[PDB]
Design a protein around this ligand. Structure first.
Ligand SMILES: Cc1cc2nc3c(=O)[nH]c(=O)nc-3n(C[C@H](O)[C@H](O)[C@H](O)COP(=O)(O)OP(=O)(O)OC[C@H]3O[C@@H](n4cnc5c(N)ncnc54)[C@H](O)[C@@H]3O)c2cc1C
Ligand SMILES: [Hg+2]
Ligand SMILES: [Hg+2]
Ligand SMILES: [Hg+2]
Length: 647
């Protein structure tokens, strides 16, 4: 119904109790039988109230004076539940019209490094929780990896772009709090070969099926044959993909020989029978004559014929088998089995499919861990993916509308004593060059690519533990850029949301393999994935944009493709503040390292906390994952520097 709906939108079992909820309400409800029944209801009921209007602060009081006959009778458990929820950011999170103003007297000082979605997400929580929160963004703007290009009437989105489902997506709440227009993505997508050729629907279907076919084989080798460690080395997805393919290439060369074989075993039978026949032609030739000339004419001529009968008559089975066989020799030479697994043209189309996976996981397929690159799948939201029409930057800007964000300052050192901790940052685009932030706790929102920067970029007085950094280095941070093309008008099909360009070579199959049309203005978004992404980051926007034009008027109008009025090209590897797209499970790593990343570090009570895209295990590499990780720490921190929820 409706109350049980909210539970789902909150990623919570409706009739069950979270491992967490169990803890905060220790048998106080995990004791009797039908007393928890009530509990859960009071939970879902609130979850519902909040969700039905996340543009306002859902008060304990408001929650109370809105419950049914029983429930609101026991005023105490309600509060218990409400606080619990409000603490974990299941209600009153994001940006809402606050009732009951913040406490002028804040408690504790928290320094949050970076102001990405996880940063802002956390910030606000803590703020609301009644704490002193200051964000140090080293980038003249908020939103980090949610970067939107805004020039005149054009809107682009070089960072996050898609909102993958609204089924249990916290982003569904934020999205309506901010009044951000989302739009569904037309699945239809046509593939144009490296010539413009639209690729016949049937070929596109066979190959794509053979893609899903291959990929699933891969899954079998992994989860059914434990083909995860070959030669004390970790198996990568791409490694396995190449195994399965090579195996189907085997079946082909195989049933190819079973054929050639029996064609020959028959060619030999006719030749072995032709001799038997040519040899019988003599016997029926030597006799046939001694018959006519010796036609002695008593019981003799009566027999030469009895003889010639048998011979001419046995010469029938031969000439009869000959045909039979001689003709079956055609049921073979006339119907060969497939001579090749995939045509050179096929593979290229197949590669596009690979590139499309590389685009998703933001890393060459070779880099992926055969066993865990899927690991998070069990939590994907329900409902179709949407595009933001007015620019994703809405969310972050909106979310920053009330906190003190120390922009343009770059944290280059983090100190943490058993007691307080110091943060030293530098300024860059404003008269300064050295600051020092003293505070109780540090919330690190630094992207995995930065924590990986060799040099490195930021230092941690007591160095980060063994376990930590070793996890940081074995995880994966990928890359993937975009090529924005602002035009004079639409020269492409308006009812199509996306179309692909088949690549030339397996390597560089990700080179501008997918154009994207999602806006009002005449604007296409070109994608560079796979190993092409990093390399391409070394070319002029001009040259890159030129390769786009070709492919374009190559598939469209005979040079009936205008000159882009405007143009942008992203380079996330280079961005010193990002160092790549987002994480991915690399061969050797696993879903555990995401957990170790969340792990707070305590000096020789905890000081250093981490959040961000690379911190959240079942929602990595996403904006909602970042936001959830954000809320998570915000809560965790306030449980130590304030108190823990009871029942
Ligand atoms: C091309 C591309 C496409 C994507 N598409 C999607 C998509 O469709 N959907 C989706 O859900 N996700 C997508 N993502 C990823 C998503 O945007 C990120 O996962 C998310 O923004 C990460 O959140 P974060 O809070 O960790 O912040 P950022 O990743 O926002 O990280 C922290 C912030 O700190 C700043 N900072 C860095 N170094 C320092 C320093 N030394 N001192 C101080 N501040 C510093 C950064 O500039 C940044 O603002 C995409 C990413 C890329 C690159
Ligand atoms: Hg397509
Ligand atoms: Hg197979
Ligand atoms: Hg906005």
């Amino acid at each position: 119904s409706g109350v049980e709906g909210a539970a789902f939108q909150s990623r919570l079992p409706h009739d069950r109790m979270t491992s967490q909820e169990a803890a905060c309400f220790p048998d106080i409800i995990s004791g009797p039988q039908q007393t928890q029944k009530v509990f859960l209801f009071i939970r879902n009921r609130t979850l519902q109230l909040w969700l039905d209007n996340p543009k306002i602060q859902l008060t304990f009081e408001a929650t109370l004076q809105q419950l049914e006959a029983p429930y609101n009778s026991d005023t105490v458990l309600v509060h218990r539940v409400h606080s619990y929820l409000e603490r974990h950011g299941l209600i009153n999170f994001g940006i809402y019209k606050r009732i009951k103003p913040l406490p002028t007297k804040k408690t504790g000082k928290v320094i949050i490094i970076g102001s990405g979605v996880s940063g802002l997400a956390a910030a606000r929580q803590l703020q609301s929780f009644g704490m002193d929160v200051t964000l140090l963004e080293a980038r003249d703007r908020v939103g980090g990896r949610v970067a939107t290009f805004r020039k005149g009437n054009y809107v682009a989105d070089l960072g996050a772009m898609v909102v993958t489902g609204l089924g249990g997506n916290p982003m569904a709440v934020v999205s309506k709090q901010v009044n951000m227009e989302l739009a569904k993505i037309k699945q239809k997508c046509p593939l144009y070969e490296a010539n413009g050729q639209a690729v016949p629907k049937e070929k596109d279907e066979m190959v794509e099926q053979e893609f899903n076919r291959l990929l699933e084989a891969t899954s079998y080798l992994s989860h059914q044959l434990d083909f995860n460690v070959l030669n004390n080395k970790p198996v990568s997805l791409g490694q396995a993909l190449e195994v399965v393919i090579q195996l189907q290439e085997k079946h082909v060369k195989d049933e190819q020989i079973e054929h050639w074989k029996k064609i020959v075993k028959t060619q030999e039978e006719l030749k072995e029978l032709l001799n038997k026949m040519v040899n019988l032609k003599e016997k029926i030739k030597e006799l046939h004559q001694q018959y006519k000339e010796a036609s002695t004419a008593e019981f003799l001529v009566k027999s030469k014929h009895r003889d010639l009968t048998a011979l001419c008559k046995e010469y029938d089975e031969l000439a009869e088998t000959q045909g039979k066989l001689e003709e079956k020799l055609q049921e073979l030479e006339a119907n060969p089995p497939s001579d090749v697994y995939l045509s050179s043209r096929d593979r290229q189309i197949l590669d596009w499919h690979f590139a499309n996976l590389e685009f998703a996981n933001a890393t060459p397929l070779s880099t992926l861990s055969l066993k865990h690159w899927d690991q998070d799948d069990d939590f994907e939201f329900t409902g179709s993916h949407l595009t933001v029409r007015n620019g994703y930057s809405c969310v972050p800007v909106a979310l920053a509308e009330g906190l003190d964000i120390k922009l343009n300052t770059a944290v280059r050192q983090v100190r943490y004593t058993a007691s307080g901790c110091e943060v030293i940052a530098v300024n860059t685009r404003s008269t300064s060059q050295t600051f020092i932030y003293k505070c109780d706790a540090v919330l690190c929102t630094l992207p995995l690519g930065v924590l990986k920067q060799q040099p490195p970029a930021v230092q941690f007085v007591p160095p980060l533990p063994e376990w930590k950094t070793s996890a940081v280095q074995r995880m994966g941070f990928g890359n993937l850029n975009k090529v924005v093309l602002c035009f004079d008008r639409v020269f492409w099909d308006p009812s199509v949301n996306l179309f692909g360009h088949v690549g030339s070579t397996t390597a560089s199959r990700g080179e501008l393999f997918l154009f994207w049309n999602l806006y009002k203005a005449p604007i296409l978004l070109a994608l560079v994935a796979g190993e092409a992404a990093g390399i391409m980051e070394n070319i002029s926007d001009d040259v890159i944009v030129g390769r786009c034009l070709a492919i374009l008027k190559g598939i469209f109008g005979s040079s009936a493709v205008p000159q882009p009025k405007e143009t942008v090209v992203s380079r996330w590897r280079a961005d010193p503040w990002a160092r790549g797209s987002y994480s991915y499970v690399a061969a050797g790593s696993s879903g555990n390292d995401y957990d170790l990343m969340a792990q707070p570090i305590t000096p020789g009570i905890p000081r250093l906390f981490f959040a961000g895209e690379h911190t959240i295990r079942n929602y990595p590499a996403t904006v909602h994952g970042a936001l959830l990780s954000g809320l998570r720490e915000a809560g965790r921190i306030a449980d130590q520097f304030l108190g823990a929820m009871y029942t």
